[PDB]
Design an enzyme around this catalytic site. Structure first.
Site, mmCIF file in Angstrom:
data_model
loop_
_atom_site.group_PDB
_atom_site.id
_atom_site.type_symbol
_atom_site.label_atom_id
_atom_site.label_comp_id
_atom_site.label_asym_id
_atom_site.label_seq_id
_atom_site.Cartn_x
_atom_site.Cartn_y
_atom_site.Cartn_z
ATOM 1 N N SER A 180 -7.859 8.155 -2.480
ATOM 2 C CA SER A 180 -7.274 8.137 -1.138
ATOM 3 C C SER A 180 -6.017 7.276 -1.159
ATOM 4 O O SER A 180 -5.994 6.223 -1.794
ATOM 5 C CB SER A 180 -8.238 7.569 -0.068
ATOM 6 O OG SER A 180 -9.321 8.440 0.181
ATOM 7 N N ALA A 200 -22.452 2.833 3.353
ATOM 8 C CA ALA A 200 -23.729 2.291 2.892
ATOM 9 C C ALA A 200 -23.516 1.106 1.935
ATOM 10 O O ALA A 200 -22.750 1.210 0.962
ATOM 11 C CB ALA A 200 -24.562 3.381 2.228
ATOM 12 N N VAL A 219 3.806 0.095 -5.762
ATOM 13 C CA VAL A 219 3.993 -0.898 -6.809
ATOM 14 C C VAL A 219 4.030 -0.155 -8.140
ATOM 15 O O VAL A 219 3.049 0.494 -8.525
ATOM 16 C CB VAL A 219 2.880 -1.960 -6.783
ATOM 17 C CG1 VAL A 219 3.023 -2.943 -7.947
ATOM 18 C CG2 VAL A 219 2.908 -2.719 -5.464
ATOM 19 N N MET A 244 -10.029 4.323 0.561
ATOM 20 C CA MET A 244 -11.155 5.224 0.770
ATOM 21 C C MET A 244 -12.075 4.759 1.900
ATOM 22 O O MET A 244 -12.793 5.585 2.492
ATOM 23 C CB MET A 244 -11.932 5.354 -0.530
ATOM 24 C CG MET A 244 -11.632 6.630 -1.236
ATOM 25 S SD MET A 244 -12.353 6.839 -2.876
ATOM 26 C CE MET A 244 -13.916 6.139 -2.640
ATOM 27 N N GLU A 277 0.851 -1.180 0.000
ATOM 28 C CA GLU A 277 0.000 0.000 0.000
ATOM 29 C C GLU A 277 0.891 1.235 0.000
ATOM 30 O O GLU A 277 1.765 1.362 0.862
ATOM 31 C CB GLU A 277 -0.922 0.013 1.232
ATOM 32 C CG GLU A 277 -1.405 1.393 1.614
ATOM 33 C CD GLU A 277 -2.409 1.938 0.632
ATOM 34 O OE1 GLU A 277 -3.411 1.256 0.363
ATOM 35 O OE2 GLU A 277 -2.191 3.053 0.118
ATOM 36 N N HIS A 337 -17.903 6.602 -6.936
ATOM 37 C CA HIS A 337 -18.221 5.242 -7.374
ATOM 38 C C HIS A 337 -17.820 5.127 -8.842
ATOM 39 O O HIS A 337 -18.579 5.517 -9.735
ATOM 40 C CB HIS A 337 -19.710 4.954 -7.188
ATOM 41 C CG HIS A 337 -20.214 5.229 -5.811
ATOM 42 N ND1 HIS A 337 -21.559 5.289 -5.514
ATOM 43 C CD2 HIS A 337 -19.561 5.398 -4.633
ATOM 44 C CE1 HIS A 337 -21.712 5.521 -4.220
ATOM 45 N NE2 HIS A 337 -20.517 5.580 -3.662
#
Ligand SMILES: Cc1cc2nc3c(=O)[nH]c(=O)nc-3n(C[C@H](O)[C@H](O)[C@H](O)COP(=O)(O)OP(=O)(O)OC[C@H]3O[C@@H](n4cnc5c(N)ncnc54)[C@H](O)[C@@H]3O)c2cc1C
Length: 498
Positions: A103, A116, A222, A109, A37, A429
């Site tokens: 993020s 939800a 990466v 994120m 990460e 999204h």
């Protein structure tokens, strides 16, 4: 300090990469797993939501540390914990995605989201998965991974008011899967009391945190998927702190780097199927705010807690149907992904937000493209976003505007007589850029097991895998597809005893 070789390497530490880690810690406890990460660890346990942090200074700092390469324009702004493209978000004459965001942190994120988790309905559902019954089992498994619950707000004094008022005006023609109901939420209670959003901390779980065969390298970029003799072969990892690169060998590579950085990494590695980055879709978002009427005040309110969430009206779900193709959610303000209004201090809980989300008219030309020469703040090939609203997009957005006003008037007095269409990308999204398909026919990046055509052993994960036109929040579905993919890798590993 990186390993010479592991069995499975995962890039990305949001719920998709975490899903692979947890499912392999369950079904493949013998396999070594390395997760890379690029962002820092900003919360405890790693990947936990920033609202677990009680100190306001430290919480704001966790957010700022998640905001990308430059983190150590007042009209185009990113929500805290995220960052925008600096350029390339819109081409000449196109709508673009002006507030496409990212993020960079352990948890992705989901360290910042509002949790939800609806199920897809009607045409949002992947049909070749739905016909076998496997889609429902995968969604159940994803709800288990995220600790999804509908009841978190059932004890508050305002429980059920919003759902009651909406049901009053809801067509008697809808059935159970479609009527107004509680939003299923990725949320849990802290041992000390407070409700709070669930993320990669919960997906990773104690089984991954306790897995001696698993390791998490934060601040690890990466730059390349190593391909060798046709197969995925490993990853090239740069330690962001010292800058040294090292190869990590691996028989399996799972890229769960979000819907735009995953195609980025594949392009940089020379893995470029025609569908890569194409069929990109955002969910146009319409927002509205209303003051609830006939509001019995609470005599002894608690005062907002220093961690976690308040308990006012909760989150209600107005489900997508083919006939009414918008995903709707009604939210107490500290559960909204967008700052809509301020609560009334005279009457806490009485101002509620609404969001409606549209399904995109999918287009081949809606895509993320990459530059041979220019690079982003990580030195990865710079993105150019191509994005156009068709006339069908505009028609469905106009529908969503009329419906959100109708739903908000049923609840209270609107703060504004008209709703607001958020700038494109605001939904956060992003689907379709590495979509799964039944066959290697040029129109998909990966198989139903999320394995990319032509690069066996390379896997993709996240909202980018969803191949259909959806309105609902995608994470639960991305995690479900990750469940199938990680089960496949476990099958392959256990079979490797041959
Ligand atoms: C304020 C807010 C509210 C939201 N509300 C909801 C909601 O209600 N419902 C819902 O479903 N979704 C919601 N979302 C969206 C949700 O957070 C995403 O759908 C979900 O996090 C996607 O998970 P992912 O792992 O696929 O990617 P991400 O969550 O983005 O995680 C990917 C990780 O990959 C890392 N990475 C990327 N590239 C590299 C690289 N090259 N090398 C090393 N690491 C890399 C990134 O740094 C990131 O940490 C919300 C988001 C926000 C910000």
């Amino acid at each position: 300090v990186y390993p010479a070789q592991v069995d499975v390497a995962i890039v990305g530490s949001g719920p998709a990469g975490a899903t692979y880690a947890r499912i392999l810690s369950e079904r493949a406890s013998s396999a070594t797993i390395a997760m890379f990460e690029v962002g820092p660890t900003v919360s405890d346990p790693p990947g936990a939501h920033v609202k677990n942090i009680a100190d306001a200074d430290e919480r704001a700092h966790a957010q700022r540390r998640s905001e990308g390469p430059h983190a150590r324009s007042a009209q185009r702004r990113a929500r805290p914990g995220t960052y925008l493209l600096e350029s390339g978000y819109q081409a000449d004459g196109e709508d673009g995605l002006p507030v496409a965001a990212f993020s960079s942190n352990v948890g992705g994120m989901a360290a910042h989201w509002t949790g939800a988790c609806p199920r897809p309905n009607d045409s949002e559902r992947i049909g070749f998965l739905d016909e076998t019954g496997e889609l429902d089992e995968l969604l159940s498994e994803g709800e288990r991974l995220l600790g999804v619950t509908t009841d978190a707000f059932d004890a508050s004094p305002y429980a059920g008011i919003v759902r009651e008022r909406l049901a009053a005006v809801e067509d008697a023609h809808r059935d159970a899967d479609e009527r107004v109901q509680r939003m299923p939420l990725a949320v849990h209670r802290r041992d000390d009391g407070p409700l709070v959003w669930s993320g990669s901390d919960v997906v990773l779980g104690d089984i991954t945190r306790g897995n001696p065969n698993f390791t998490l390298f934060d601040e690890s970029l990466v730059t390349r998927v190593l391909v060798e003799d046709g197969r995925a072969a490993g990853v090239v990892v740069t330690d962001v702190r010292t800058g040294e690169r090292r190869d990590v060998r691996a028989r399996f590579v799972v890229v769960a780097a979000d819907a735009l950085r995953t195609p980025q990494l594949l392009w940089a590695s020379g893995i470029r199927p025609d569908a890569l980055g194409r069929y990109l879709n955002d969910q146009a978002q319409i927002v509205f705010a209303v003051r609830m009427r006939d509001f019995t005040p609470v005599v002894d309110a608690d005062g907002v807690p220093q961690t976690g969430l308040s308990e006012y009206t909760g989150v209600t779900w107005v489900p997508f149907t083919d006939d009414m193709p918008f995903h709707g959610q009604v939210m107490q303000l500290d559960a909204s992904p967008v700052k809509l209004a301020d609560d009334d201090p005279a009457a806490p809980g009485s101002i509620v937000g609404l969001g409606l989300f549209c399904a995109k008219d999918l287009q081949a030309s809606d895509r993320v493209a990459f530059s041979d020469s220019d690079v982003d703040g990580y030195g990865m090939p710079a993105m150019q976003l191509h994005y156009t609203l068709s006339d069908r997009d505009h028609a469905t957005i106009d529908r969503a505007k009329a419906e959100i006003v109708r739903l908000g008037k049923a609840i209270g007095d609107p703060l504004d007589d008209r709703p607001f269409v958020m700038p494109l990308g605001a939904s956060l999204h992003y689907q379709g850029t590495v979509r799964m398909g039944l066959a290697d026919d040029g129109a998909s990046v990966c198989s139903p097991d999320s394995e990319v055509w032509g690069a066996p052993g390379l896997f993709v994960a996240g909202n980018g895998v969803i191949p259909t036109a959806t309105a609902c929040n995608p994470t639960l579905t991305g995690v479900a597809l990750a469940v199938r993919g990680a089960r496949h890798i476990a099958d392959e590993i256990t079979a490797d005893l041959a």
